[PDB]
Design a protein around this ligand. Structure first.
Ligand SMILES: CCn1c([C@@H](C)NS(=O)(=O)c2ccc(Cl)cc2)nc2ccc(C(F)(F)F)cc21
Ligand SMILES: CCn1c([C@@H](C)NS(=O)(=O)c2ccc(Cl)cc2)nc2ccc(C(F)(F)F)cc21
Lengths: 274, 17, 271, 15
């Protein structure tokens, strides 16, 4: 039981950055869009329809007054109805990405990097940091992401949902019952990835990632003696590797959908190379 | 020329705080 | 059974078919809930605990939007559904005005009488039309892509006069012809305030009533429907009492929180 | 005076 002074300061800054840039109540997420009240080409559609399952979520909006609006998506009836929630998704993702950019900006180690590497790191980790943050508001009991007044509920077994990598990721990560400190260190490890395409200061970044990883391993050693947390550090590191694979996969779905039904916001176009 | 192809990111990074 | 009675029913049925958009396909661009004075407010709050319904919107694509109203929490939540209600009522009233306009017996009346009759019966004819789209099994008014379901409280519902009215009327299982004759009897009420041609109106109401009584005698076997005509007439009297009660509620709300459309202001005497 | 106080209804009745 004992972290170095340098480690304590590292966690403190990370936690301070998280508190300053993660609006956990989503109180500032507003003015978003809502769903209205040959052969090769067709092959693309068959694929796109497969990439939207199992993304399907119902949406709930709780008003301050106590009222509730609930949106149930349409069944795949072969068209463009499957894209009803994309504009809203684009607004939510953009909102999350801005919070992720702000997170990175307040970190001293990030600000010291060249502007080009800051861009390269953000492009590479925006999806990942977003999902890590979403996991903290994910209710595994109800299969719902509780985003302040907004709730996104998975469409109603487990074995079937666990087939979707991103879905399995959320349930698996939630089961670990991580502390805020561990989530923020995961975000830092993912952010400072030396192997993102376009990074020039690959050396400094690699050195930074290692220090965040050592800090995470130390934090776990100092606070997790329970036999329920054996190999926790390694499980986290393995999950981060999986998240990187999921990121690449989701990026390929995004481009595919964008190709046939453009919907990405200008910030998203920059982040994912559209 | 990363900055030139990512105007928004560039702007957001320059704004700071 | 007389040829004249047959013609009277035909004109009424023709009017109903031409002016009752049963699928509400033309009801659009409506508003939806966003995503001594103390004595007045206290009464108004009580006038709105009785205007609760959940709302469902089924999109063409198969998607569904569902709205659950807020509980009475204090202020400016109890008025969330008023703008929508104002649009639905206005839409219904326009259909009722069109209905009356196509009726020869109505057109012959002085313009002032037409106005007086419509002001007096607009709520009533609306509720009679709503009854035809009321599903008593689910306690829901099925208005095309829109559905209004009552939110149950901890026989309970039967306490609300308008709700009891809808279940009781639906239980009679009336024909289109009987509903339209009910609308005519309510429309041609000689005792509405402001009517000048009391004699002519009373005579018209009687002829519609005789036609209804005759239709029932001819089309309905016998014992179980022996008093159907009188049950209908009793329901019309009840509806008239409910109309007066709801009108008072409307004015009270309007006084503290104006929301009536210009057409509603004219129909219920709001300056 | 009644028509005067009900212009919309009057308009709707004349079309
Ligand atoms: C494509 C599924 N999806 C995702 C992906 C990238 N991850 S996920 O499935 O774990 C998920 C699902 C919902 C939320 Cl809120 C967060 C994460 N993020 C979304 C945000 C909003 C909405 C939509 F609600 F607009 F459909 C859908 C989202
Ligand atoms: C206030 C309840 N209500 C009424 C009352 C007077 N009668 S009712 O309860 O039998 C009823 C309720 C709902 C419908 Cl649709 C019809 C009749 N009429 C309404 C019309 C539209 C709407 C609104 F929901 F559109 F706001 C609500 C209405």
């Amino acid at each position: 039981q004992g972290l170095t002074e340098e480690q304590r300061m590292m966690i403190r800054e990370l936690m301070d950055a998280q508190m300053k840039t993660f609006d956990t109540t989503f109180s500032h997420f507003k003015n978003f869009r809502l769903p209205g009240v040959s052969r090769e080409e067709a092959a693309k559609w068959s694929q796109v329809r497969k990439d939207l399952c199992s993304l399907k979520v119902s949406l709930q909006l709780r008003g301050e007054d106590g009222s509730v609006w609930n949106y149930k998506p349409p069944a795949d009836s072969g068209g463009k109805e499957i894209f009803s929630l994309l504009p809203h998704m684009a607004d939510m993702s953009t909102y999350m990405f801005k919070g992720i950019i702000s997170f990175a900006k307040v970190i001293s180690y990030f600000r010291d990097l060249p502007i080009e590497d800051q861009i390269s790191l953000l492009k590479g980790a925006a999806f990942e940091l977003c999902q890590l943050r979403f996991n903290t508001v994910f209710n595994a009991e109800t299969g719902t992401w509780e985003c302040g007044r907004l709730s996104y509920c998975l469409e109603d077994g487990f074995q079937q949902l666990l087939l979707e990598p991103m879905l399995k990721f959320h349930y698996m990560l939630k089961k670990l019952q991580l502390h805020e400190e561990e989530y923020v260190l995961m975000q830092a490890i993912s952010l400072f990835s030396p192997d993102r395409p376009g990074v020039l200061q690959h050396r400094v970044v690699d050195q930074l990632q290692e220090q965040f990883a050592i800090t995470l391993k130390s934090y776990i050693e100092c606070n997790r003696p329970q036999p329920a947390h054996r190999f926790l550090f390694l499980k986290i590191m393995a999950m981060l590797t999986e998240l990187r694979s999921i990121n690449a996969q989701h990026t390929q779905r995004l481009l595919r959908i964008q190709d046939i039904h453009p919907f990405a916001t200008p910030l998203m176009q920059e982040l994912f190379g559209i | 020329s990363l900055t030139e192809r990512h105007k928004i990111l560039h702007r957001l990074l320059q704004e700071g705080s």
